[PDB]
Design a protein around this ligand. Structure first.
Ligand SMILES: Cc1cc2nc3c(=O)[nH]c(=O)nc-3n(C[C@H](O)[C@H](O)[C@H](O)COP(=O)(O)OP(=O)(O)OC[C@H]3O[C@@H](n4cnc5c(N)ncnc54)[C@H](O)[C@@H]3O)c2cc1C
Ligand SMILES: Cc1cc2nc3c(=O)[nH]c(=O)nc-3n(C[C@H](O)[C@H](O)[C@H](O)COP(=O)(O)OP(=O)(O)OC[C@H]3O[C@@H](n4cnc5c(N)ncnc54)[C@H](O)[C@@H]3O)c2cc1C
Ligand SMILES: Nc1nnc(-c2ccc(O)cc2)s1
Ligand SMILES: Nc1nnc(-c2ccc(O)cc2)s1
Ligand SMILES: Nc1nnc(-c2ccc(O)cc2)s1
Ligand SMILES: Nc1nnc(-c2ccc(O)cc2)s1
Ligand SMILES: Nc1nnc(-c2ccc(O)cc2)s1
Ligand SMILES: Nc1nnc(-c2ccc(O)cc2)s1
Lengths: 586, 586
């Protein structure tokens, strides 16, 4: 147990010092390593309840039982006297840079997970390379370092959501006494895009600075794993070469899908293109009903667009469907049109005018599930019909990395693949929630297990979410229907209430915001799931995710006192049950 | 234990039925009570693990051991056959209305706590009266039913805070692409006040409707307790009479203090007058440094006012002083002036012009702690120098209710005074946090213990707060300095970080928002206190208060995953300690 941990830690750490906080000989080795600019992990044995056993087991590797003990890539280097000997003879730099491989770690993919893992590994002296390449979209769109969230995801989508929210802030301002006239104010798409892209550019640059300052090698090149320790890279001049690494992290993410219909790739766009589009989309059709589809349709309408969403079956498949219907009803009452139970079968009427900065014009044909026809003209058609990896481009099938039937990597609970030195994190890890903070935690925690002797695993359960539709939807845990399927309706109690933000009173709806707690009767009214539709829903939801992680019950919500006046305090006084039939209105 | 609970429950309930969910004889008594419109508490013995013992102990009162058993004001009324006998003979209405007193409950004070207690007691058949009277301010201001929060506190102050926030929403809108020009927009105070007061008026009316629909008697009269069961009332015609009640709840709240200096009462105002003021205050001095003082100065400045705050010693005494200084620094950088270490020694230069709706003009003289002089002219002077009860007006000292040296009521942990039938809730309960949700929980929980056999007490520990200054400050638990005083600096670890809202990037400060967790090393890094300065701080803080109630540790925050992009997620990845000396900047 202790011995098995120590073997794994010694074998995979790049540079590690076993030490105690009270030893001046350990302090004297630290100071020499710092002055030589030698980064390393350190384990302070006097701070571990198991340290006496670890100190005994170290002798299996070094034939000594004292501290300090310095290891480099699985090899005992020496005690105090020996390390200073190498230092005085200027032999130390060559000893700690000695490796069978070019890098201790090669990360394939420079996005949320991969950048987090690479920076964290370099902290402990792992010689690290991060590879990133952005294959252009069909119309040619490309972007800089940072991945999907930074460039074409969470960051620009929430900034355009805020632009949409400010439309209603402007309307509200009149009722609170300000002299503006909202009906005479308009929005300039190109001005907003320039500001969004200026922020994204500061993030691209920030990541490059961060890697340089952590001594991480950044290669803007496409990587391919051709054997367990060999990565073939192709650069911007099509030069092809091979680099080797001890540990490999796959972190290449996904890209948008297109439907297999005529004209889709030629004349439509995806979210990859939307966030840098030089012209306002105009009259827009969004095909799909995921959170990407609804978030984009929502802010486009708030910015003055004529928007339609084509829904094949249901909204927000996989989310609580009572909540999904309330989200969509709010959008439909506030300027979004819906074509329900409908799919597309795209013809070009006008080519995009790039010189005068105008969209083209398209004719869309489709059909409803009963057979009736759809036919209408749009200036822009956005596909939001799912995302997928293309690991055949990343991974030679002779390496032996197992994939599932959706093409994602099958991993153990420590992110290890079926090849012992190769790991996968982020969206390509089969079965895991596909979110940026999950990818960051996985990569950071993994780097610490590989190179600093850590043991902590990432916990993927009850991860909270927020959908940034015009009225936001936050959730943590099970949907009501999933809880009833798992435990049975007789064991499920649901407490719920409508509410009205105080900010909405002077601004003139009473009963559109809504919240509920889904609870298990036979486990002390355990909170299985929390759901809220209203302003600032992500700020509301986040703190409750800690309580749910700790096993909160309805009694825990009851005994906690509210903060007044807030939206969130309504969770502290819920009392109306669905079984009672009593109305939830205010 | 069981027998002592049952004696207290029988003695004080107004109308209570002991029953089981499976008994058709109990269902048959319920249906008769409902049809006669007889409200009552019910205790279902088959749902209590102690019910077998309760059923045995009932025989001590009734000489029978079966269900149903109906009691009225401590007296056994009968089993099934007997109750239907009274019903058939039309004797039942007179039996259940029989009382030695006019009311089962008299509530003195119709504010946050008193309205909550009165409505809840009426649910269980307690015949209830609520008394409310609003003594006018020195200049004559008065208002309707609902108490301090509704009329001259949390509700209007947060609505004017929102009006202030919308000033910065208007500036931000230009950067996000909207065509407005903020420098050409102004604010109309009287328009905002009319809208705020229209909402307050809907709340006044709503409370009157609610009491009428719960069969609560509302008397707009001043109440005085002259003996344990006798309340003398004085109405709007100076008619004086006496009503009697079994249980009494004191819930009369506090009013603003004035400094003992010439001209203060004659020429200054307080928060009681501010929220319905017919004219804009103009150039304003706020004397004091409480959360009331800073909240009011903050929104007045955001609405275009020239504002100064006179601070005797420190800001936000009793709150974390690192956080208090950051709150004040933000205000000073954003248009509020501060006169530090200064107190006033007020002369009238112009009388208020009520016909043309203009303030007067005043000369304020004061001095700094070193002896230097203060002298400046203002249009309005607002005093925010504390609040106090005046229980000598409410409570004859011969009744025997014990008060502390600040004039607040000394209560047991179930809100009982030194007179056994008299209770106190809300701001006048000595030692308790003076907040609206605390008053509401105390009153609701108390009504259930008196009239429904409940046992649950109000928990007054770790109650979260938010100060609605221009940049908001939320907190839950100990300040850093209180934790260090209690446990010693060697046992305290503090994790902290600056942060920048994503909404602030395109809008153009980097390092003003701030958060920290104050933790106890020797108790598994228990979170003793949480603190955040930033937008939407009350929404951020609320959910964490449940986790802190449950004993959250730093490890609980670490294992929980963030929601991206939010401000609140920064709590899930804190790592920089104050002891390390590493910078907290972004
Ligand atoms: C529109 C949209 C909105 C979203 N909004 C949110 C949100 O609000 N909150 C949230 O938590 N999540 C959100 N997400 C999800 C989030 O973007 C992803 O979960 C996250 O980016 C996944 O991180 P990753 O490291 O797995 O991959 P990525 O961030 O996709 O990074 C992979 C990188 O590797 C590169 N790469 C691929 N193949 C190779 C190769 N062979 N060689 C070298 N480099 C290669 C890719 O081009 C890319 O730069 C959103 C996603 C989208 C599409
Ligand atoms: C400016 C300001 C802002 C505040 N903001 C907040 C905030 O954001 N959040 C928060 O949680 N708290 C806030 N508070 C505190 C909150 O208002 C109080 O904690 C709460 O109102 C106390 O409730 P209560 O029932 O104890 O008394 P009150 O609400 O004061 O009700 C007492 C009532 O009894 C009446 N009364 C008095 N004497 C008699 C008598 N003899 N006979 C009959 N009736 C009588 C009074 O006139 C009054 O109507 C604020 C307070 C102020 C002053
Ligand atoms: N952080 C923020 N996100 N949205 C804001 C907003 C939205 C709608 C409004 O009516 C007013 C303000 S502020
Ligand atoms: N900057 C760049 N890095 N790699 C590039 C690349 C790689 C493989 C290809 O097939 C085509 C282009 S371009
Ligand atoms: N018309 C359509 N709307 N959604 C579609 C979809 C969504 C996710 C997927 O992974 C695959 C397809 S097709
Ligand atoms: N609920 C809300 N409270 N404030 C809001 C706001 C404030 C400042 C801004 O810049 C934009 C919006 S929305
Ligand atoms: N509407 C009102 N109810 N009571 C009033 C009152 C009571 C005592 C006084 O001393 C003066 C006025 S006015
Ligand atoms: N000049 C002053 N600023 N604050 C004061 C104060 C505050 C609370 C109190 O309870 C009493 C006095 S006096």
């Amino acid at each position: 147990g202790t011995s098995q941990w120590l073997r794994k830690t010694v074998d995979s750490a790049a540079v590690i010092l076993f030490s105690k906080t009270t030893c001046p000989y350990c302090k004297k080795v630290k100071d020499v390593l710092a002055e030589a600019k030698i980064k390393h992990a350190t384990i302070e044995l006097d701070q571990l309840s198991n340290g006496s056993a670890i100190q005994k087991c170290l002798a299996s590797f070094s034939k000594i039982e004292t501290v300090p003990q310095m290891f480099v890539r699985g090899k005992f280097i020496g005690d105090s006297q020996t390390v200073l000997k190498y230092y005085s003879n200027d032999e130390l730099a060559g000893i700690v840079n000695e490796s069978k491989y070019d890098y201790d770690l090669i990360v394939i993919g420079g996005g949320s997970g991969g950048l987090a893992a690479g920076k964290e590994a370099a902290k402990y002296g792992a010689k690290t390379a991060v590879l990133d390449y952005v294959e252009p979209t069909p119309i040619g769109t490309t972007w800089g370092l940072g991945g999907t969230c930074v460039n074409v995801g969470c960051i620009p989508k929430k900034l355009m959501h805020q632009a949409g929210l400010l439309s209603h802030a402007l309307e509200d301002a009149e009722h609170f006494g300000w002299s503006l006239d909202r009906s005479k104010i308009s929005h300039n798409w190109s001005t907003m895009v320039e500001g969004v892209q200026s922020h994204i550019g500061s993030l691209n640059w920030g990541y490059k600075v961060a890697l340089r300052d952590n001594q991480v090698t950044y290669l803007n090149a496409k990587g391919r794993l051709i054997s367990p320790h060999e990565v073939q890279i192709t650069d911007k001049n099509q030069k092809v070469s091979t680099i080797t690494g001890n540990k490999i992290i796959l972190a290449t993410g996904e890209r948008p899908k297109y439907p297999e219909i005529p004209g889709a790739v030629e004349y439509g766009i995806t979210s990859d293109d939307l966030f840098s589009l030089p012209y306002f989309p105009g009259k827009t059709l969004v095909i799909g009903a995921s959170y990407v589809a609804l978030e984009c349709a929502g802010f486009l309408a708030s910015l003055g667009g004529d928007v339609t969403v084509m829904v094949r079956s249901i909204l927000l498949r996989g989310f609580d469907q009572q909540m999904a219907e309330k989200v969509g009803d709010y959008m439909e009452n506030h300027g979004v049109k819906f074509a329900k139970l409908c799919v597309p079968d795209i013809k070009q009427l006008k080519v995009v005018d790039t010189e005068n900065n105008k969209p083209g014009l398209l004719l869309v044909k489709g059909h409803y599930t009963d057979g009736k026809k759809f036919e209408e003209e749009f200036e822009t058609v956005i596909f939001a019909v799912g995302r997928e990896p293309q690991l055949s481009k990343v991974l030679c099938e002779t390496v032996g990395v197992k994939l599932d039937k959706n093409g994602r990597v099958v991993c153990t609970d420590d992110e290890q693949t079926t090849v012992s030195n190769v790991y996968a994190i982020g969206d390509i890890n089969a079965g895991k929630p596909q979110l940026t903070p999950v990818a960051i935690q996985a990569g950071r925690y993994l780097a610490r297990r590989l190179f600093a002797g850590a043991t902590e695993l990432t916990d993927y359960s009850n991860v909270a979410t927020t959908v940034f539709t015009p009225l936001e939807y936050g959730a943590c845990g099970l949907s009501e229907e999933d809880a009833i399927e798992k435990y049975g309706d007789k064991d499920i109690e649901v407490y719920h209430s409508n509410f009205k933000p105080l900010e909405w009173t002077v601004a003139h709806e009473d009963n559109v915001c809504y919240m509920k707690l889904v609870c298990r009767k036979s486990d002390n009214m355990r909170v299985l799931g929390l759901h809220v539709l209203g302003p600032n829903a992500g700020e509301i939801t986040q703190g409750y995710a800690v309580a749910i992680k700790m096993g909160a019950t309805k009694a825990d919500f009851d005994r906690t006192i509210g903060i007044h006046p807030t939206c969130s305090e309504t969770f502290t006084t819920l009392h109306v049950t669905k079984k009672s039939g009593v109305s939830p209105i205010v």
